[PDB]
């Protein structure tokens, strides 16, 4: 959590920095890359302090848990112990969760800075221009437009809006499905309750699981929660994300609080969209599995669609998926540092994961980002201090390419305690080959005291 | 007998309270079934709106959102499932029938329509810039009036004597409210177009032995002569088989402020 917030503090440095470039000044490439890396390495160290709590924490109350379920239990209760039941579902949100954080610290401070054309009505324009119509004086020309003015006018007549409300539709659809992809939901409901849209506000309110605590006939009275015909509700709003007559963007909004993936990945546009879109349906996908197990409805003659409710996960496939899309730009973030170690800290995968920080010395030893490097060694102090094991010849020449950048971008100093992170034999014999190149006597005095104030064996060293 | 008699330990009264408004809850939808059912067959081929309202007056919420996805209205069929129980959506539609006032839209919405979000929104009546008024109780009979009281103006927590309260805080003359209940007569009057224009000389103004029965059970002391008048059963004041077999299970029950002349009246 602290090395979040030294490298959050330098990713807002170097923000304040490029913020500050003049537009194509070739010299700022190095400062937005940098910025990009420590961005990225910031949201890591994010992933690693969430699912290495879980895994720790699962691993103490494991021999505990004899649970019993109600035979009265609601939607809420059977995720409720859904959640305390299963780590692949918990693990899959925290991963949710997580993607969710990154979009919302891309968003900022910036959601009352939005302008639209429409200020006192929705749609304004049309409504405007259907009140003008209606005057015996229009000598104006007849545009094909609605004619009625509920929102589901210009998909039951086959009708557009004049472009100022259908430009402010598709802003604010973007801008609803920017807050969904943030967590950011009840944003959405305020932004669609501030544009006068009241009824999309009610329609993003209606995945909520149902509750009724008074069923157990307490002592005082408690509020019902959620929508008691949710799976209903998302098979409607699954028929609305499949007319290509509703906007991309509010198609993929149905889709990500319904489970449809098929009509969401065509609007997630990045390697975090893309990842987020599996995860946020692969937790909404188990959740019906166990809810469609455990709660008994009847008489209810639809049913969800069996791409989905027939749906296989696993950690793994969601990460072969993601090297089967065609989206060009995935398939090239897919291949990056950062994203490489989120896949494996999702997969737990410790062993693959020191393969491939061998496959990276192997061919890039000398050219590898110093920062990268950092973050490489303090991974493994942080498996280590947690008694995880790790390919040890890896990690020792992870060290030895740590301490070799170390002496070679200009420090002496810090070497002492990245050396007696090592058995005695490799930690004296690379703190002396270190010394082997120290010829200035006040810089000898000075790296055998850092010695000694890292518990070296100075007398095997020297 | 079926839902507290399961139970193997003394019910507690808050069980029993909504156990009765569960029964009474069925007893409201299947006391205005055959008018709906027969309301449908005539409005569906002209006005789904009107079909989808009735449907809604007997809480037949999944036959009107069928409605709505058969008609074309998706997105009423969508509003209409989320509202079974939901407050935020019905604080959410009273902002929109604010907004829709104030901006003089309104007056671009079909009067039907905005009935159904006024029932949705637990507003009785809605006030209109054209300064019409929609009364949603309009045109109804008192059982699905109270309904509209038991399931749309009141939370899922209350009781029927708040629901019963608030339909004759609704049919009265007050100095501050016009009346938007139906006054709400024996099932023999019912649908009749019967605005009684306050008889002259009767004091008291007739209704049905059920609203008389939900008295007597909410007041120990309310009235039993207007309870077994046989013109708050049948359309005939001949016809005392019921008023007789009321009175002799009421004296059963311990009920004992009939008066002998009374008595006697029924006896002979």
């Known amino acids: ?66 649970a019993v379920t109600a035979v009265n239990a609601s939607e809420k209760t059977v995720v409720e112990a859904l959640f305390q039941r299963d780590s692949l579902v918990r693990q899959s949100q925290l991963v949710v969760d997580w993607l969710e954080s990154i979009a919302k610290d891309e968003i900022g401070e910036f959601s009352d800075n939005i302008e639209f054309y429409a200020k006192s009505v929705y749609w304004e324009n049309t409504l405007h221009t259907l009140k003008q119509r209606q005057l015996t ?8 437009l609605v004619t009625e003015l509920d929102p589901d006018a210009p998909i039951r007549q086959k009708m557009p809006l004049d472009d100022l409300d259908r430009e402010d539709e598709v802003r604010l659809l973007k801008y609803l499905f920017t807050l969904i992809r943030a967590g950011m939901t009840e944003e959405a409901q305020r932004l669609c309750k501030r544009c006068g849209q009241a009824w999309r506000a009610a329609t993003l ?74 995860f946020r349906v692969m937790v909404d996908s188990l959740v019906e599995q166990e809810i469609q197990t455990s709660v008994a409805t009847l008489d209810e003659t639809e049913e969800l669609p069996r791409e989905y409710l027939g749906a296989n996960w696993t950690l793994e496939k969601v990460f072969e998926e993601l090297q089967a899309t065609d989206k060009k730009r995935v398939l090239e973030e897919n291949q990056e540092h950062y994203h490489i170690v989120q896949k494996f800290l999702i997969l737990g995968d410790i062993d693959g994961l020191m393969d491939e920080f061998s496959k990276w010395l192997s061919k890039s030893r000398n050219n590898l980002p110093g ?8 991974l493994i102090l942080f498996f280590r201090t947690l008694g995880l094991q790790t390919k040890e010849e890896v990690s020792i020449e992870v060290l030895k390419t740590y301490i070799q950048l170390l002496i070679r971008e200009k420090h002496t100093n810090l070497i002492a305690f990245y050396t007696c992170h090592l058995p005695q034999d490799l930690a004296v014999a690379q703190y002396a080959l270190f010394l082997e190149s120290v010829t200035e006597f006040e810089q000898r005095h000075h790296c055998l005291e850092l010695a000694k104030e890292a518990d070296l064996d100075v007398a095997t060293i020297t | 007998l079926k839902e507290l008699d399961s139970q193997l330990n003394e019910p507690r009264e808050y069980i029993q309270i909504l156990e009765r408004r569960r029964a009474f809850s069925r007893w409201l939808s299947c ?76 007056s671009f919405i079909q009067d039907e329509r905005l009935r159904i979000f006024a029932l949705l929104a637990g507003k009785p009546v809605w006030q209109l810039s054209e300064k019409k008024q929609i009364n ?36 009265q003359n007050t100095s501050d409210s016009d009346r938007y209940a139906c006054s709400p ?84």
């Open chain 1, 1 to 66: 959590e602290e090395y979040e917030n030294i490298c959050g503090s330098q990713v807002n440095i170097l923000s304040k920095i490029v913020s500050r470039a003049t537009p194509g000044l070739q010299k700022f490439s190095k400062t937005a890359s940098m910025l990009w890396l420590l961005q990225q390495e910031m949201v890591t160290w994010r992933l690693l302090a969430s699912l290495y709590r879980d895994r720790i924490q699962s691993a103490l109350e494991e021999e505990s848990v004899f």
């Open chain 1, 137 to 144: 004086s229009y000598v104006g020309s007849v545009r094909p």
């Open chain 1, 205 to 278: 309110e209606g995945w909520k699981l149902y509750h009724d605590p008074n069923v157990n006939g307490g002592t005082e009275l408690e509020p019902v929660e959620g929508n008691p015909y949710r799976r209903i509700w998302k098979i409607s709003c699954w028929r609305m994300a499949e007319d290509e007559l509703f906007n991309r963007y509010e198609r993929a909004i149905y889709a990500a609080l319904s489970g449809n993936l098929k009509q969401l990945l065509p609007v997630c546009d990045t390697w975090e969209d893309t990842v987020w879109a599996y």
């Open chain 1, 371 to 378: 920062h990268l490097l950092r973050f490489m060694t303090h």
């Open chain 2, 31 to 106: 006391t205005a079934t055959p008018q709906i059912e027969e309301e449908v067959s005539l409005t569906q081929k002209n006005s789904p709106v009107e079909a989808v309202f009735s449907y809604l007056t007997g809480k037949r919420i999944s036959e009107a959102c069928s409605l709505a996805q058969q008609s074309g209205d998706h997105r009423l069929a969508l509003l209409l499932s989320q509202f079974v129980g939901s407050q935020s959506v019905r604080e959410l539609l009273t902002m929109q029938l604010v907004d829709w006032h104030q901006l003089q839209a309104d």
């Open chain 2, 136 to 171: 949603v109780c309009s045109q109804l009979d008192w059982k699905r009036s109270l309904a509209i009281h038991l399931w749309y103006l009141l939370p899922p927590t209350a009781s029927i004597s708040r629901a019963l309260s608030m339909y004759e805080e609704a049919f």
């Open chain 2, 185 to 268: 007569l024996p099932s023999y009057l019912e649908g009749s177009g019967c605005v009684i224009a306050e008889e002259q000389n009767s004091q008291t103004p007739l209704r049905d032995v059920c609203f008389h029965l939900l008295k007597l059970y909410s007041d120990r002391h309310y009235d039993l002569n207007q309870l077994l008048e046989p013109r708050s059963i049948t359309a005939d004041p001949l016809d005392y088989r019921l008023s007789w077999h009321l009175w002799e299970v009421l004296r059963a029950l311990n009920y004992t402020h009939l008066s002998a002349q009374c008595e006697g009246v029924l006896q002979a």
